[PDB]
């Protein structure tokens, strides 16, 4: 037996249109204003001058000041979820990244880059490498502690105390680091990048109950969109236990309306079918596949 999505995924293939497919998705693409991102006050705000927020669907700081923070919330009204995608933090953006966490009540951040890549700083250092060594981000009056950390081959999960200097509360924020996933690429096989969703979808960062998760890589666009494909669809064939039902390039279509580029290659939005591909067998019932992703990830 074969799915809906597997076997538009075999004809892409034999045709080898894969470039084609993807263009075509850029072409139907979105186009909405960011004239705030492009304000001159914000040019040292957005690390790449072509990635920039929609006006529409930007995070907004509740800062008096400048409000402005290159992210965007993803709202997928049909399956329910919501995440905000970003770039990585500048080193002066950080404590504007923070403040959104605590503002928008988020419980968990994922990171899929690197802080160095290709030669390049891609991102702030962000958050803090030692216990002993807090950081306080003095423009938004917020103090960050590094409680934990459980460091695996290819990612590590951070647990973080981020706290209001303003009132004393405190919360826990968890962080899922991928660091095995390439700037432009793809990740090294099905099975370890849903180990690693998994993972963020059991620690409950996902939940209804808490803000949208923050997602970033160092655009927040092409790692960040794949992953967020890949679990939109797979929560939409769960709602409705129905892999037919889940149009990937469509479902694809409607985050862009949110925000800009999401994917960034052709082989990435391949990756995002083998991946939803994949994790149907979970969604339709057979939990043992992720043992075999565990397995197949080498994490020890
Ligand atoms: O980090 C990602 O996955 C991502 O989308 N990166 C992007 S998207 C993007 C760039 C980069 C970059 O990292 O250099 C450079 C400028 N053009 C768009
Ligand atoms: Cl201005
Ligand atoms: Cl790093
Ligand atoms: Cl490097
Ligand atoms: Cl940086
Ligand atoms: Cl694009």
Redesign the pocket.
């Known amino acids: 037996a074969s799915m809906e999505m597997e076997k538009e995924f075999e004809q892409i293939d034999k045709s080898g249109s894969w470039a084609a497919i993807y263009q075509d998705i850029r072409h139907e693409a979105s186009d909405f204003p960011c004239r705030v991102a492009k304000l001159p006050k914000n040019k040292n705000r957005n690390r790449?001058r072509?990635?920039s927020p929609f006006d529409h669907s930007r995070i907004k700081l509740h800062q008096e000041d400048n409000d402005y923070i290159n992210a965007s919330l993803i709202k997928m009204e049909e399956a329910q979820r919501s995440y905000i995608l970003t770039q990585?933090p500048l080193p002066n953006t950080c404590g504007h990244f923070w403040e959104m966490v605590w503002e928008q009540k988020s419980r968990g951040v994922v990171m899929?880059?690197r802080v160095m890549?290709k030669g390049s700083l891609?991102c702030a250092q962000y958050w803090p490498q030692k216990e002993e060594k807090e950081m306080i981000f003095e423009d938004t009056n917020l103090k960050l502690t590094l409680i934990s950390e459980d460091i695996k081959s290819y990612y590590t999960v951070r647990q973080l105390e981020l706290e209001n200097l303003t009132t004393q509360e405190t919360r826990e924020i968890l962080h899922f680091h991928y660091t095995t996933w390439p700037?432009?690429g793809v990740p090294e096989s099905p099975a370890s990048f849903l180990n690693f969703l998994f993972k963020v979808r059991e620690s409950g960062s996902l939940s209804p109950e808490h803000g949208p998760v923050v997602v970033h890589?160092?655009?927040?666009?092409?790692?960040?969109?794949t992953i967020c494909l890949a679990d939109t669809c797979l929560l939409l064939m769960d709602k409705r236990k129905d892999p037919s039902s889940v149009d990937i390039k469509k479902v694809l279509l409607e985050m862009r309306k949110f925000r800009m580029?999401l994917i960034?290659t052709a082989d990435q939005l391949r990756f995002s079918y083998l991946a939803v591909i994949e994790g149907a067998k979970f969604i339709m019932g057979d939990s043992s596949v992720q043992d075999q992703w565990k397995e197949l990830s080498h994490e020890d």
């Open positions: 790449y072509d990635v990585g899929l880059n890549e891609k700037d432009f890589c160092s655009a927040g666009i092409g790692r960040s969109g580029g960034q």
